[PDB]
Swiss-Prot record:
Its EC number is 3.6.5.-. It is a multi-pass membrane protein. Signal peptide: none annotated. GO terms for biological process: axonogenesis; endoplasmic reticulum membrane fusion; endoplasmic reticulum organization; endoplasmic reticulum tubular network membrane organization; protein homooligomerization. The chain holds residues 31 to 338 of 558 of the full protein. The gene is ATL1. The keyword Ion transport does not apply. Atlastin-1 (ATL1) is a membrane-anchored GTPase that mediates the GTP-dependent fusion of endoplasmic reticulum (ER) membranes, maintaining the continuous ER network. It facilitates the formation of three-way junctions where ER tubules intersect. Two atlastin-1 on neighboring ER tubules bind GTP and form loose homodimers through the GB1/RHD3-type G domains and 3HB regions. Upon GTP hydrolysis, the 3HB regions tighten, pulling the membranes together to drive their fusion. After fusion, the homodimer disassembles upon release of inorganic phosphate (Pi). One of its GO terms (cellular component) is Golgi apparatus. This is Atlastin-1. Expressed predominantly in the adult and fetal central nervous system. Measurable expression in all tissues examined, although expression in adult brain is at least 50-fold higher than in other tissues. Detected predominantly in pyramidal neurons in the cerebral cortex and the hippocampus of the brain. Expressed in upper and lower motor neurons (at protein level). GDP binds at R47, K48, G49, K50, S51, F52, Q115, R184, D185, V243, N246. It catalyses: GTP + H2O = GDP + phosphate + H(+).
Length: 305
């Protein structure tokens, strides 16, 4: 019986609590504690499609050797679920996946769900710290945005990446590895196609710095590029009104929009295929499951005092 485990939470006193006992129970088990880890995080605001997406990532991780891992077209969705509260923090999946690479060594896959809002100036520090810790631990950060990538989205991205930099060890190269803009309800396929190719051209125009841009407009883009060695973008279509208006969607897979499943079938392996798995690195050293827990404990202690 696997499920989501609340690892990081923000108490009402605006302090940060890390469930170390739950962290150790998952990542320090003898079967996985000494294995190089890949940490994939889906980060975004509440009610933006994160749990619905990660249930399909689980379907892929539990059925990688199946062609139709998404499920039966005529039957409801099957498998474990994150969709069990608007809690600002980080959740991880209780089961760590051991993936045999094309090589002969087993790699560990950790899945993270990061949640928080940047709406008001009051809840800004709490969500910035949570999203910072998510970016510092994960090897791929999936920025889950809705409809478009707006300027405030980049400002917030600059905010929690700057929080993370101030706590990390100083590095000559870039501090983080992979950032991905996941635009969830893309409604302009006639400008940029659904998927990674359209997202690449879209993000190219968005994060382009030009001399006619405002000073604040270019400087936030210079910062974002300096933080990640790779930055990607995937334009995902709308899943349909049955998914959008149902809390915890339980209908048949047929009732999800066909274009959504088509691009979802290529989004998930684009993220989690064994060939694309890059080991998490901190300060230039490949991190193991045991080491990732140590950095999580070390980073959280810096933000407390
Ligand atoms: N418009 C839209 N709605 C979605 C999408 N994915 C899920 N939903 C629906 O929107 C609501 C989001 O809930 P959920 O994703 O579980 O919450 P979250 O994990 O905190 O973002 C649910 O009712 C879903 O059925 C999406 O890509 N676009
Ligand atoms: Mg969630």
């Amino acid at each position: 019986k696997a499920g989501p485990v609340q690892v990081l939470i923000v108490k009402d006193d605006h302090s940060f609590e890390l469930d170390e006992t739950a962290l150790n129970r998952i990542l320090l088990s003898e079967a996985v504690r000494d294995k190089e880890v890949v940490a994939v995080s889906v980060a975004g605001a509440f009610r933006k499609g994160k749990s619905f997406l990660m249930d399909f990532m689980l379907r892929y991780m539990y059925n990688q050797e199946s062609v139709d891992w998404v499920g039966d077209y005529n039957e409801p969705l099957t498998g474990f679920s994150w969709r069990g509260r608007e809690t600002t923090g980080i959740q991880i999946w209780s089961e760590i996946f051991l993936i045999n690479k094309p090589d002969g060594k087993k790699v560990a896959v950790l899945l993270m769900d990061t949640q928080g809002t940047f709406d008001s100036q009051s809840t800004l520090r709490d969500s910035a710290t949570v999203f910072a810790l998510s970016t510092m631990i994960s090897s791929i950060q999936v920025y889950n945005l809705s409809q478009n990538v707006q300027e405030d989205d980049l400002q917030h991205l600059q905010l929690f990446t700057e929080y993370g930099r101030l706590a990390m060890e100083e590095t000559f190269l870039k501090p983080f590895q992979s950032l991905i803009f996941l635009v969830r309800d893309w409604s302009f396929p006639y400008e940029f196609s659904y998927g990674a190719d359209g997202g690449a051209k879209f993000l190219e125009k968005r994060l382009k710095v030009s001399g006619n841009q405002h000073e604040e407009l270019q400087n936030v883009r210079k910062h974002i590029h300096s933080c990640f060695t790779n930055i990607s973008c995937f334009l995902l279509p709308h899943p349909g009104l049955k998914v959008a208006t149902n809390p915890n969607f339980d209908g048949k897979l047929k009732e999800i929009d066909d274009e959504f499943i088509k691009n979802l079938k290529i989004l998930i392996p684009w993220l989690l295929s064994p060939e694309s798995l890059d080991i998490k690195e901190i300060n230039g050293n490949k991190i193991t499951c045991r080491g990732l827990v140590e950095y999580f404990k070390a980073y959280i202690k810096i933000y407390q005092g």
